[PDB]
């Protein structure tokens with residue numbers, strides 16, 4: 001009994017469900033861009049079957065690849081949104097841990113609050129990590145470094161009014177590798193009545209976290225076998 005799920009079944013080369021996902025048509029605009037955030041260096045997003053498609057073997061493929069002078073990739077945001085008191089999990093394979101790449105699985109909200117379940121940074125500086133943000137600019141957060149490899153893994157979070165918890169490859173009764181108490185973040189928005197969040201799966205190229213892709217190996221793929229919330 002899932003409140004939201006996508007098993008990404010369907011024929012090779014087809015698009016993910018338009019009923020479940022919004023596919024980004026552009027990379028967000030960066031207000032005061034660092035070098036790799038500059039228009040013309042930042043990677044782009046588009047709804048193109050070369051960059052986001054089902055492999056016909058039960059996986060969503062998000063692919064970053066150079067087209068002309070621009071790196072293109074993809075971002076999906078769930079149309080559905082879910083509130084407190086659920087468990088959220090995706091099975092993911094990062095075939096894209098290369099210079100310039102910046103994959104992420106996260107729960108978003110356009111007002112405040114963000115649960116970055118896992119991000120890996122290709123810029124050669126930032127360690128991969130799980131992060132909880134509160135506050136409008138996300139300027140109040142707790143973060144936890146965790147290593148990412150290219151194997152299949154399940155990334156899980158639970159959150160409610162009292163806190164947020166994270167697991168890697170969850171097994172029965174395992175302790176979260178990271179948890180955050182509401183009381184540890186003064187502006188904790190997750191306890192607001194009716195507060196909900198959408199799911200995001202994306203593979204960015206360049207920008208701050210991605211950095212220089214010139215030495216990286218492209219095409220680079222992020223595979224998603226499923227996303228489930230219950």
Ligand SMILES: OCCN(CCO)CCO
Nearest residue numbers: 097098099121122123124
């Ligand atoms: O975190 C980034 C790692 N990345 C940066 C290289 O300069 C190398 C990946 O193989």
Ligand SMILES: [Ca+2]
Nearest residue numbers: 007058225226
């Ligand atoms: Ca699947």
